Amino acid sequence: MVSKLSQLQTELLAALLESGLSKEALIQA
Amino acid sequence: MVSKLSQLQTELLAALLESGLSKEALIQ
């Protein structure tokens, strides 16, 4: 069900939050 | 003011939303 694109998005979203980006900033952008 | 890490985060955010990820998933 999950495409390579969705898997890459999932992994980058996770890496962004682990790197310190706030959920609020995540939201705005 | 903006570090390399912050700049990379900004660029990846841009790219994620342009790729089609919803703001809702983004926030979740």
UniProtKB/Swiss-Prot annotation, chain A:
Disruption phenotype: Mice are born at less than half of the expected frequency. Neonates are slightly smaller than normal and do not grow normally. After 5 weeks mice weigh only 50 to 60% as much as their littermates. Mice develop non-insulin-dependent diabetes mellitus (NIDDM) 2 weeks after birth. Mice exhibit elevated levels of blood glucose, combined with reduced blood levels of insulin and insulin-like growth factor I (IGFI). Males and females are sterile. Residues 1-29 are annotated as: Dimerization. Ubiquitinated in s SPOP-dependent manner; leading to prteasomal degradation. Disulfide bonds: none annotated. Residues 1-29 form the HNF-p1 domain. It is found in: Nucleus. Liver. Belongs to the HNF1 homeobox family. Binds DNA as a dimer. Heterotetramer with PCBD1; formed by a dimer of dimers. Interacts with PCBD1. Interacts with BHLHE41. Interacts with NR5A2. Interacts with SPOP; this interaction promotes ubiquitination and degradation of HNF1A. Transcriptional activator that regulates the tissue specific expression of multiple genes, especially in pancreatic islet cells and in liver. Binds to the inverted palindrome 5'-GTTAATNATTAAC-3'. Activates the transcription of CYP1A2, CYP2E1 and CYP3A11. This is Hepatocyte nuclear factor 1-alpha.
From Swiss-Prot, chain B:
Disruption phenotype: Mice are born at less than half of the expected frequency. Neonates are slightly smaller than normal and do not grow normally. After 5 weeks mice weigh only 50 to 60% as much as their littermates. Mice develop non-insulin-dependent diabetes mellitus (NIDDM) 2 weeks after birth. Mice exhibit elevated levels of blood glucose, combined with reduced blood levels of insulin and insulin-like growth factor I (IGFI). Males and females are sterile. Residues 1-28 are annotated as: Dimerization. Liver. Ubiquitinated in s SPOP-dependent manner; leading to prteasomal degradation. Residues 1-28 form the HNF-p1 domain. It is found in: Nucleus. Binds DNA as a dimer. Heterotetramer with PCBD1; formed by a dimer of dimers. Interacts with PCBD1. Interacts with BHLHE41. Interacts with NR5A2. Interacts with SPOP; this interaction promotes ubiquitination and degradation of HNF1A. Belongs to the HNF1 homeobox family. Transcriptional activator that regulates the tissue specific expression of multiple genes, especially in pancreatic islet cells and in liver. Binds to the inverted palindrome 5'-GTTAATNATTAAC-3'. Activates the transcription of CYP1A2, CYP2E1 and CYP3A11. This is Hepatocyte nuclear factor 1-alpha. It comes from Mus musculus.
